[PDB]
RNA sequence: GCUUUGUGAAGGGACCAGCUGGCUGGUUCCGUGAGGUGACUUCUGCCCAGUGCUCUGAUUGUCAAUGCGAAGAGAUUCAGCC
RNA sequence: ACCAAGGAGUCUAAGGAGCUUGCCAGUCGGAUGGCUUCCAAAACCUUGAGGCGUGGUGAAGGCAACUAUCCUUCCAGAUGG
RNA sequence: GAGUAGAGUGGCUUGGGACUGCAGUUUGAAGAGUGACGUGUAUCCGUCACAAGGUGGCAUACAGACCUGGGACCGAUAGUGCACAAGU
RNA sequence: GUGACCUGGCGCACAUGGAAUGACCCACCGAACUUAAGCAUAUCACUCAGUGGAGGAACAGCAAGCAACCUCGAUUGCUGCAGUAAUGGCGAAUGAACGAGCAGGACCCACGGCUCUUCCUGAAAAUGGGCUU
């Protein structure tokens, strides 16, 4: 038991009585796969030129957007949660992050 | 106990579970699963027969959206109507819904306008739909029965409507490409989400404070 | 069902669990044991073993595409064991008006014209009694595959073609595995209508050709 | 109305009216018998609430509970096994002393059919209960739709199946939701449902 | 995983939909006083009069001593609510009970 | 069912009779709401 | 045979799961329920410190639950007495 | 003592590490749903929630993987120019 | 909808943990509200429901016994103890 | 003047109940072997045995419910949640529920998912009743 599974024979931590998970339900994807999901028209019609084509991630069941993976052009991302590396990587390509129920 | 690396067993069979001589056991096998879909299947077409002029299912049913933050964007069937949106379809009497195929439930009510909307033109699409058989065949026929509606009743397999998740996976289809709003381009969401979440936790210390300063106020 | 207790040492039996009680022979027999007479076998079978088996669905297909090539290829259907001498080529298609057959007569006629009435008279002649006490188990014969017929929709041509021996009938909306490879071995002969043959690779969802290796 | 009076007299029980005369009810109580029959309802209010009516079909009886605990019947209180096990005195039973009242006056009159009971006296040794019984095969019964239901070969010996409201108190069902988790269908239902080892065709 | 912590929606005040007012059902007129019951019930209320122990709680609240007569209900009741509620009625009927003394 | 069984013996061939009747069709009641009247007026000038 | 022992009946012993239950007991100290020793004869000595049993007021110590008091916003805490 | 017949590593839930096959940021989906004398309780179908995977870390409050031409660095190292 | 719900305490039960449920006993409400909102308490606020009465079909279980259809099952030391005048 | 009620009884008449049933069900009662490499809480197990009662099903059932959501809307069964939250000499082990997807929401039940009692009304629901026909 030492050696196959240390960290067994103990307590530790807050015990969550009635521990709900569907408020704690939270999937995240990253900036690396956002423009995979702009169908390339808009993100071809929208390169240089001042309008950025939206990304709804709950339509793609994504919740929390995470910033990790460079963003080739700014776009709109809807969402319920980013995290601030997420909106700094979005805002400086342009775009915007918007909370979103 | 393996004499190697395999995980804790955690095997949850301490129980009897198994039928040997001296035990039942708490198996159950559902050998039945093949033949019993065939039997649905007849039974469910013998409902049909049965109540025949009328859709196979029967009751229309509301569209609202499925409970928790998880499946908040998926919608779903309900049970029944509320008085409400009979009320805004045009239906007063909630009995006379029912019989003639609309469900009702008192038990639910519109916290909002949007299901209330959604659900009254569902039933304004319904009794548009809908061709109801004169009591006693050959006295008053209503408006829009054409006296061959009552001639070809056809009993449709799904009741016309679309798929009920068809109605957040609606609402979940972004718009098309757009400028900035100068709010979008000044605004911090993560500032603002971690704000809204300190929040709640200095309620007591921002009372505290006030009172501090009060009392330094009169000192 | 038995209340059978062991004897014990002290006793020049052996320790195996044997029948209570006295006055019959069964009396002290051992009892509760593979290795007894009357007594239950070793590891009882059990009715919740895994009886079915889990195929994904691409697999299966895939199986069924392969199936088809080779049902295409020739020299494995002779080699499966269809006569081809009368068969003009491979795979044998045929027009739709078949699928309208109503007697077992007209099919028969069609087959001979075709070139696989001989597989069909070989199964008839080599119908046998199943050997082996499959026979006593309601598996009466042992009768061998001849070819296989695949129609577009449900028709007469079932019916029609039903009572020939080998012949096995088929769809293109749903086409058994079962059918196209039976025994687990490949290169059945099958006689397609024109609209299942038509309407092959669009149900099987082909789209290419594949490269293969030569 | 009189039977919103009579409910809140016999809501202030402690008071000196209802205190003498239930002394003198515990009294007569105690010198009839264990399970009399009544001509009419003590506490008419509460009999006509639980569903009692003054039609030829039904029938009230009277009927006391010893009081206290259970004591297991193991002679000389040696409870071989294990120590838990090992316990004689302090047992309580699992069934309420009204759905026992129930089930007395269910098993004496084998013929009739058990609606609801209701507590009408206690004192030192016994509790007293009421039992309203129905005669399921009377004309009167059989027409009234309303209790109807009752001559159904179903409603045999609901007393005797916890199907009363006594019954249905000890069984946890007056609470559902999450205060009611494994209790229904069953108890032993439940059990075996999440106890079951479900082997489907493919697993 | 997927399990991370997420802020609720009316938190970050977002409001996907527009609320309609909660409306007043027949359900919540269990809630208004009930005139006619009170009757009722303060007539019940002079027939039978008081239990022991509310007769108790009288005769400390006329000595004063209203915390050991909200103990006195609490031991009784077990509720601190109970407990506050009866000890307003005693006060409310000891009341009564000096008016109509003078 | 180790005893003459001398009348659940004749109850259950009569079930064994309606289950091997049902299992061919589901029953038909001869006379029901919609034929009474019909049947019995026609009884009645036979009769008559 | 001897000798202790409990018992005057709302009692001694004692069964029963339970009982307004059955037993000793159709009894009542010359009766009896519980021990020990072992006819007659001749004796049965000293020790109540230990353990046991028993008596007192158990007036001084320890000692439960309930109850009564105090403080607390309350859960609760603390004191004294039986 | 002798001979004959029987006679003992089995099935199941979960799992481990190889091997095979299919698909791929997906995969599976035979709970269920559509069809069609016996065969067929089969075969076929993508209505499918969801399971596992795509993110981890903190007891928790929670937070969440830099890099705008491309590319983490070093040592050994398969190919190839 | 009152000896009820609840509370002290005891005991069983539950994953339910300052006690999920039940039961004895003592106690015992409100109804100018009550119950639940999974950490005991006090203070505010909110959401949902309206206990202590009752009916109530459907999808559900079904090793017996009867009526059927089947089987990669056993094949007289096997398969039920019994293929037979075997619970003899 | 020798009654009217109440409360009990005896006889008669017309009826229910009783007993049985190698599966399933409902209510109780209730072990130990075993496991923990010993054993006592734990486990087997709220199981076996025991008692009582059935029906073709039984039980449950149109919220003093779930949830905290953009809410839902009887119960039941399945998928799954999930071997998770939680319990446990925090050892051996034990261990749900809701969300969500379904079947069902035709039928021999229904005031088509409610109703009794409370509350309102009220000369018992109105041309006496009974036996034969």
Redesign the interface.
Request: charged share 30%; hydrophobic share 35%.
């Given at each position: 038991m030492d050696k196959?599974?240390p960290g067994?024979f103990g307590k530790v931590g807050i015990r969550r009585f009635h521990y709900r998970?569907?408020?704690?339900?939270?999937?995240?994807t990253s900036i690396s796969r956002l423009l995979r999901l702009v169908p390339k028209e808009?993100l071809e019609?929208?390169k240089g030129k001042?309008?950025?084509?939206?990304?709804?991630l709950?339509?793609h069941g994504y919740?929390?957007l995470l910033g990790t993976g460079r963003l080739s052009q700014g776009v709109?991302v809807?969402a319920?949660?980013?995290?601030?590396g997420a909106?700094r990587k979005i805002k400086k390509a342009?775009?915007?992050?918007?909370?979103?129920? | 106990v393996k004499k190697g690396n395999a995980p804790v067993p955690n095997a949850h069979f301490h129980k009897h579970w198994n039928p040997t001589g001296s035990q039942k056991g708490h198996v159950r096998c559902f050998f039945k699963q093949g033949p019993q879909k065939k039997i649905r299947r007849a039974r469910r077409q013998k409902k049909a027969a049965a109540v025949f002029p009328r859709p196979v299912k029967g009751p229309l049913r509301p569209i609202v959206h499925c409970k928790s933050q998880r499946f908040n964007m998926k919608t779903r069937l309900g049970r029944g109507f509320t008085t409400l949106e009979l009320k805004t379809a045009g239906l007063t009497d909630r009995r006379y819904a029912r019989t003639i195929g609309i469900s009702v439930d008192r038990r639910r009510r519109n916290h909002c306008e949007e299901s209330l909307a959604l659900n009254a033109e569902r039933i304004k699409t319904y009794l548009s739909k809908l061709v109801l058989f004169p009591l006693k065949a050959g006295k008053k026929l209503p408006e829009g029965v054409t006296e061959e509606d009552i001639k070809n009743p056809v009993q449709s397999k799904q009741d016309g409507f679309p798929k009920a998740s068809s109605y957040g996976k609606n609402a979940l289809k972004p718009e098309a490409p757009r400028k900035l709003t100068d709010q979008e381009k000044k605004r911090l969401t993560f500032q603002f989400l971690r704000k809204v979440q300190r929040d709640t936790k200095m309620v007591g210390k921002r009372i505290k404070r006030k009172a501090k300063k009060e009392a330094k106020a009169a000192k | 069902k038995h209340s059978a207790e062991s004897w014990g040492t002290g006793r020049a039996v052996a320790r195996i669990p044997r029948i209570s009680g006295g006055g019959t022979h069964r009396s002290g027999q051992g009892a509760f044991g593979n290795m007894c007479r009357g007594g239950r076998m070793f590891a009882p079978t059990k009715v919740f073993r895994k009886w079915h088996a889990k195929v994904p669905r691409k697999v299966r297909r895939l199986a069924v595409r392969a199936a088809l090539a080779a049902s295409a290829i020739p020299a494995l259907v002779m080699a499966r064991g269809h006569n081809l001498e009368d068969v003009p080529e491979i795979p044998l298609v045929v027009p739709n008006s078949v699928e309208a057959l109503e007697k077992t007569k007209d099919a028969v006629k069609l087959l001979k014209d075709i070139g696989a009435y001989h597989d069909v008279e070989k199964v008839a002649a080599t119908k046998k009694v199943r050997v082996g006490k499959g026979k006593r188990r309601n598996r009466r014969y042992c009768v061998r595959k001849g070819p296989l017929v695949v129609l577009s929709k449900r028709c007469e041509a079932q019916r029609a073609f039903r009572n020939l021996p080998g012949v096995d009938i088929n769809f293109v909306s749903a086409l058994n595995l079962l059918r196209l490879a039976p025994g687990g071995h490949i290169g059945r002969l099958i006689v397609f209508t024109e609209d299942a043959f038509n309407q092959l690779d669009k149900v099987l969802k082909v789209d290419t050709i594949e490269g293969l290796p030569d | 109305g009189v039977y919103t009076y009579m409910q809140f007299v016999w809501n202030k029980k402690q008071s000196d009216v209802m205190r003498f005369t239930q002394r003198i009810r515990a009294w007569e109580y105690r010198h009839s018998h264990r399970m009399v029959r009544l001509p009419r309802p003590t506490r008419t209010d509460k009999a006509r609430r639980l569903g009692y009516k003054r039609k030829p079909g039904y029938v009230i009886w009277r009927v006391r509970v010893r009081r206290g605990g259970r004591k297991r019947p193991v002679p000389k209180g040696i409870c071989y096994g294990k120590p838990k096990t090992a316990g004689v005195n302090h047992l309580m039973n699992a069934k309420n002393m009204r759905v026992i009242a129930e089930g007395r006056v269910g098993k004496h009159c084998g013929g009739l059919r058990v609606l609801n009971s209701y507590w009408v006296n206690a004192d030192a040794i016994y509790k007293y209960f009421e039992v309203i019984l129905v005669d399921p095969m009377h004309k009167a019964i059989r027409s009234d739709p309303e209790i109807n239901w009752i001559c159904k070969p179903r409603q045999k010996h609901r007393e005797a199946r916890g199907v009363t409201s006594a019954g249905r108190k000890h069984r946890g069902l007056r609470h559902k939701g999450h205060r009611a988790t494994k209790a229904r269908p069953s108890v032993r239902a439940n059990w075996k449902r999440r106890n079951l080892v479900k082997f489907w065709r493919y697993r | 995983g997927k399990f991370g912590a997420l802020p609720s929606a009316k938190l970050r005040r977002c409001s996907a939909v527009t609320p309609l007012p909660k409306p007043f059902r027949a359900r919540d007129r269990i809630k208004k006083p009930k005139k006619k019951l009170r009757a009722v019930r303060d007539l019940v209320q002079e027939v039978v009069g008081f239990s022991p122990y509310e007769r108790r709680m009288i005769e400390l609240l006329k000595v004063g001593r209203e915390k050991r007569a909200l103990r006195f209900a609490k031991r009784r009741l077990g509720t601190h609510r109970q407990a506050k509620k009866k000890r307003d009625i005693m006060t409310e009927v000891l009341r009564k009970m000096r008016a109509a003394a003078h | 069912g180790t005893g003459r069984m001398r009348h659940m013996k004749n109850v259950l061939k009569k079930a064994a009779v309606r289950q091997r009747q049902d299992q061919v069709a589901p029953h038909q009641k001869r006379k029901t709401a919609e034929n009474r009247k019909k049947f019995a007026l026609s009884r009645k000038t036979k009769l008559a």
């Amino acid at each position: 038991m030492d050696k196959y599974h240390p960290g067994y024979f103990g307590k530790v931590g807050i015990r969550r009585f009635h521990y709900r998970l569907n408020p704690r339900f939270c999937p995240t994807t990253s900036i690396s796969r956002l423009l995979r999901l702009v169908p390339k028209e808009q993100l071809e019609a929208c390169k240089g030129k001042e309008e950025l084509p939206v990304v709804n991630l709950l339509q793609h069941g994504y919740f929390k957007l995470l910033g990790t993976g460079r963003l080739s052009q700014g776009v709109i991302v809807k969402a319920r949660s980013f995290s601030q590396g997420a909106e700094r990587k979005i805002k400086k390509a342009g775009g915007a992050c918007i909370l979103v129920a | 106990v393996k004499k190697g690396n395999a995980p804790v067993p955690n095997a949850h069979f301490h129980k009897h579970w198994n039928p040997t001589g001296s035990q039942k056991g708490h198996v159950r096998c559902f050998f039945k699963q093949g033949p019993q879909k065939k039997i649905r299947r007849a039974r469910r077409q013998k409902k049909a027969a049965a109540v025949f002029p009328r859709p196979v299912k029967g009751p229309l049913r509301p569209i609202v959206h499925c409970k928790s933050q998880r499946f908040n964007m998926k919608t779903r069937l309900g049970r029944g109507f509320t008085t409400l949106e009979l009320k805004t379809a045009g239906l007063t009497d909630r009995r006379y819904a029912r019989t003639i195929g609309i469900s009702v439930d008192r038990r639910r009510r519109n916290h909002c306008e949007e299901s209330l909307a959604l659900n009254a033109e569902r039933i304004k699409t319904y009794l548009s739909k809908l061709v109801l058989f004169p009591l006693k065949a050959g006295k008053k026929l209503p408006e829009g029965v054409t006296e061959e509606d009552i001639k070809n009743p056809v009993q449709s397999k799904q009741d016309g409507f679309p798929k009920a998740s068809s109605y957040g996976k609606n609402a979940l289809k972004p718009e098309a490409p757009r400028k900035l709003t100068d709010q979008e381009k000044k605004r911090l969401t993560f500032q603002f989400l971690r704000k809204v979440q300190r929040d709640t936790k200095m309620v007591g210390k921002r009372i505290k404070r006030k009172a501090k300063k009060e009392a330094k106020a009169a000192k | 069902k038995h209340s059978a207790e062991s004897w014990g040492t002290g006793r020049a039996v052996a320790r195996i669990p044997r029948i209570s009680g006295g006055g019959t022979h069964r009396s002290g027999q051992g009892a509760f044991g593979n290795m007894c007479r009357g007594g239950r076998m070793f590891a009882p079978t059990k009715v919740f073993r895994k009886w079915h088996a889990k195929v994904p669905r691409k697999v299966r297909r895939l199986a069924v595409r392969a199936a088809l090539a080779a049902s295409a290829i020739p020299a494995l259907v002779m080699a499966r064991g269809h006569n081809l001498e009368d068969v003009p080529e491979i795979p044998l298609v045929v027009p739709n008006s078949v699928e309208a057959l109503e007697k077992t007569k007209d099919a028969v006629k069609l087959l001979k014209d075709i070139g696989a009435y001989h597989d069909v008279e070989k199964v008839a002649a080599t119908k046998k009694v199943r050997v082996g006490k499959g026979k006593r188990r309601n598996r009466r014969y042992c009768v061998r595959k001849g070819p296989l017929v695949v129609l577009s929709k449900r028709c007469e041509a079932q019916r029609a073609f039903r009572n020939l021996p080998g012949v096995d009938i088929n769809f293109v909306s749903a086409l058994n595995l079962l059918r196209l490879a039976p025994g687990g071995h490949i290169g059945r002969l099958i006689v397609f209508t024109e609209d299942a043959f038509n309407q092959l690779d669009k149900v099987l969802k082909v789209d290419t050709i594949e490269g293969l290796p030569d | 109305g009189v039977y919103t009076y009579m409910q809140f007299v016999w809501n202030k029980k402690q008071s000196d009216v209802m205190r003498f005369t239930q002394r003198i009810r515990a009294w007569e109580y105690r010198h009839s018998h264990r399970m009399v029959r009544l001509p009419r309802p003590t506490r008419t209010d509460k009999a006509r609430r639980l569903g009692y009516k003054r039609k030829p079909g039904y029938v009230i009886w009277r009927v006391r509970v010893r009081r206290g605990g259970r004591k297991r019947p193991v002679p000389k209180g040696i409870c071989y096994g294990k120590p838990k096990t090992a316990g004689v005195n302090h047992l309580m039973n699992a069934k309420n002393m009204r759905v026992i009242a129930e089930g007395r006056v269910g098993k004496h009159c084998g013929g009739l059919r058990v609606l609801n009971s209701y507590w009408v006296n206690a004192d030192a040794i016994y509790k007293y209960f009421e039992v309203i019984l129905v005669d399921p095969m009377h004309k009167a019964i059989r027409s009234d739709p309303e209790i109807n239901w009752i001559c159904k070969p179903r409603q045999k010996h609901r007393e005797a199946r916890g199907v009363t409201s006594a019954g249905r108190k000890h069984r946890g069902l007056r609470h559902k939701g999450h205060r009611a988790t494994k209790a229904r269908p069953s108890v032993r239902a439940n059990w075996k449902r999440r106890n079951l080892v479900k082997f489907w065709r493919y697993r | 995983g997927k399990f991370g912590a997420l802020p609720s929606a009316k938190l970050r005040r977002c409001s996907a939909v527009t609320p309609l007012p909660k409306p007043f059902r027949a359900r919540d007129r269990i809630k208004k006083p009930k005139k006619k019951l009170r009757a009722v019930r303060d007539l019940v209320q002079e027939v039978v009069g008081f239990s022991p122990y509310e007769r108790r709680m009288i005769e400390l609240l006329k000595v004063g001593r209203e915390k050991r007569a909200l103990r006195f209900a609490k031991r009784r009741l077990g509720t601190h609510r109970q407990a506050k509620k009866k000890r307003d009625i005693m006060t409310e009927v000891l009341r009564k009970m000096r008016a109509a003394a003078h | 069912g180790t005893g003459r069984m001398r009348h659940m013996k004749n109850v259950l061939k009569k079930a064994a009779v309606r289950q091997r009747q049902d299992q061919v069709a589901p029953h038909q009641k001869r006379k029901t709401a919609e034929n009474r009247k019909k049947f019995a007026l026609s009884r009645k000038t036979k009769l008559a």
